[PDB]
Design a binder for this molecule. Structure first.
Ligand SMILES: Cc1cc2nc3c(=O)[nH]c(=O)nc-3n(C[C@H](O)[C@H](O)[C@H](O)COP(=O)(O)O)c2cc1C
Ligand SMILES: Cc1cc2nc3c(=O)[nH]c(=O)nc-3n(C[C@H](O)[C@H](O)[C@H](O)COP(=O)(O)O)c2cc1C
Ligand SMILES: Cc1cc2nc3c(=O)[nH]c(=O)nc-3n(C[C@H](O)[C@H](O)[C@H](O)COP(=O)(O)O)c2cc1C
Ligand SMILES: Cc1cc2nc3c(=O)[nH]c(=O)nc-3n(C[C@H](O)[C@H](O)[C@H](O)COP(=O)(O)O)c2cc1C
Ligand SMILES: [Ca+2]
Ligand SMILES: [Ca+2]
Lengths: 182, 181, 181, 182
């Protein structure tokens, strides 16, 4: 069984991308198991001085060890001002500074959702440029951009229910599972 | 006289970009007064729940008001992992949610420095894409990419000394001053 | 009254973006006259040897002069392979080499359409990066990405009909008109 | 012996990138053979109407068949206005429309050179975004950006002679050769 984890790019309780991430474990192919990674909320802003005098934040090393243990990582994130959320980017800046950089050679799947029609596509291309330097193995197609995400979820359960969205989500995961087999 | 402020993208005290930023005051045109904005170090990670429950952070409000009063903003920052540093971007995310969005229509000048020959060039274009949604007035030329800034600064004073760099910057500021109108 | 011209990025006769372009004349503000520039179809591939030996192509010179006379340029184009179409970009490469570079300081408005929901959004930001080196004055908002334009046009007239799209465009032009100053 | 070919992004006789491309065959690892692809100069501007009424240009199909035959492709190109040269992009637009798109799943190496200090880096990131849609297998590091390329070549021979540039060029090719073994 492949072990895939999710890195969440939004910090709000009712996050839509948060709902997409929690739905993935329930629709993953039988040969895949998905779990959520710890939240990035308590990670402090990156400062070279702290890295030297304090060492690495426990939260950063905990997140890093779980990524190394996993066979694949799915980054589920919204788009902020046509790009990557500062919080998520900051968690990536810390990670990129670690011994045995956790994402190098690591299979990565990208997922974004927005209330807008474009569904976070802009965020995705900047993210790939970032992951290139970190040497992650990013899967090309299929891509997933959840537009008008609010009309495809269930507020109570906090999950995706729109049939169309569920099939594409399941399709991509399957492709990612086959991708990981490398 | 024009009032210009600097937004710093690095937090370490030995910051080379910080050196660039603190050098701008004495090489700017005689019609410009360059001062620094507060550090983005205390600005907490963006969370809509916080915006709703607590309102906007006081540090964010302070940063914003200084931006509103300025005639222009010079963003001085390094490039982290082929893009914009997490901290700087997070501060921008916060500012972008403000009712009277501070950077809307605000003239902006970009400058980056790095220990490598590319001088933070990649970071600049991602930052330009981001600035479109904030609706800022970003100047085109001349651009400034400080390649290997470590060889052209003076540690004792923490300012730039390489005459070539100094004239480049001065030319850019002079150009930014004309841009304001 | 302002003179605005359109640079078309697609060459096929059934071009949806072409439909957008030819619709702009009757939805523009009363202070703007929108006309089309010549097609980029005859512009040959850029080659410095040709620039040196033959000089600039007459078609390139013609395109340039019309750009110089206009108060603004609206670039209407599709998105090919997640970026700017080869032909359009090649025409820009030619213009960029001209002594009195036509687009320098020229206000530019970008609009794209596609048969998909993204509406050529990716192409727009690459094009914005390119326009920095040409030193153009590119407007920020509102932006226009015509998603699935095929469902909102009228083949018999070859113009846009979807009222929502029409008002969006009109609003953009009105905004571009104010931008010129 | 792996068969690698070069796609040239500049059309001028004295092209510096042209010199870099011609030097590659002479410094490739013993397990690799490099050849130049036909020139893109005579390829007409892409027009959907021509594709339908005329079919594909012979030059486009000749270039496409040679790419399919090769084990790897090195794109050597300059940077025009912070991006990909229109001519090269146009040759890619035609290619992307072919049956059995020639670059899908094809190993690709990127090389750029400029008279400027940045050496065509801007062109490279836009190109990768393009190759992602075409589903090419693009190698991450090492990257090659030849800055101030004019002071590293020999006008007469039309080749690179700067020792430093030659070593990196040889290093990348070796990495690409090992990369191709996939
Ligand atoms: C700082 C900030 C910037 C935003 N900018 C964008 C943007 O550039 N593109 C976009 O599609 N949506 C943007 N939005 C709207 C988000 O898509 C929307 O708030 C979304 O539902 C947030 O993701 P979440 O629900 O998982 O918290 C922005 C939201 C925030 C908080
Ligand atoms: C998290 C992190 C990521 C880095 N990644 C890059 C990069 O992608 N490109 C680059 O040119 N330099 C990179 N560097 C090197 C910086 O350019 C160099 O540390 C610089 O001197 C930092 O800016 P400062 O001196 O103002 O603190 C990185 C540094 C850090 C801390
Ligand atoms: C070479 C080529 C590449 C294409 N690639 C893309 C793409 O990357 N993104 C997209 O949204 N549409 C793409 N399409 C579909 C176009 O959006 C669609 O054909 C469009 O209607 C063309 O613009 P036009 O109608 O003005 O000729 C491509 C079309 C062609 C001819
Ligand atoms: C249309 C055009 C646009 C140019 N724009 C850029 C640019 O954006 N970045 C850059 O580094 N060099 C630029 N240059 C300078 C080239 O790097 C230089 O002419 C180079 O030596 C061309 O590649 P080649 O020698 O193989 O023909 C431009 C050249 C041309 C012909
Ligand atoms: Ca929260
Ligand atoms: Ca030639």
């Amino acid at each position: 069984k492949l072990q895939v984890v999710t890195l969440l790019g939004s910090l709000r309780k009712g996050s839509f991308n948060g709902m997409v991430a929690r739905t993935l474990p329930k629709i993953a192919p039988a040969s895949m198991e998905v779990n959520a990674l710890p939240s990035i909320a308590d990670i402090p802003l990156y400062d070279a001085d702290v890295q030297q005098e304090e060492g690495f934040p426990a939260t950063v090393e905990a997140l890093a060890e779980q990524i190394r243990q996993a066979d694949g990582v799915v980054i589920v994130t919204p788009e902020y001002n046509y790009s990557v959320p500062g919080g998520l980017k900051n968690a990536i800046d810390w990670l990129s500074r670690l011994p045995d950089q956790p994402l190098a050679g690591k299979p990565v799947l990208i997922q974004t959702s927005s209330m807008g029609v474009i569904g976070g596509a802009r965020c995705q291309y900047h993210l790939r440029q970032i992951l290139v330097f970190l040497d992650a193995m990013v899967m090309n197609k299929p891509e997933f951009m959840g537009g008008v995400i609010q009309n495809k979820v269930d507020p109570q359960t906090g999950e995706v229910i729109d049939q169309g969205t569920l099939d594409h989500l399941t399709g991509q995961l399957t492709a990612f599972g086959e991708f990981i087999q490398r």
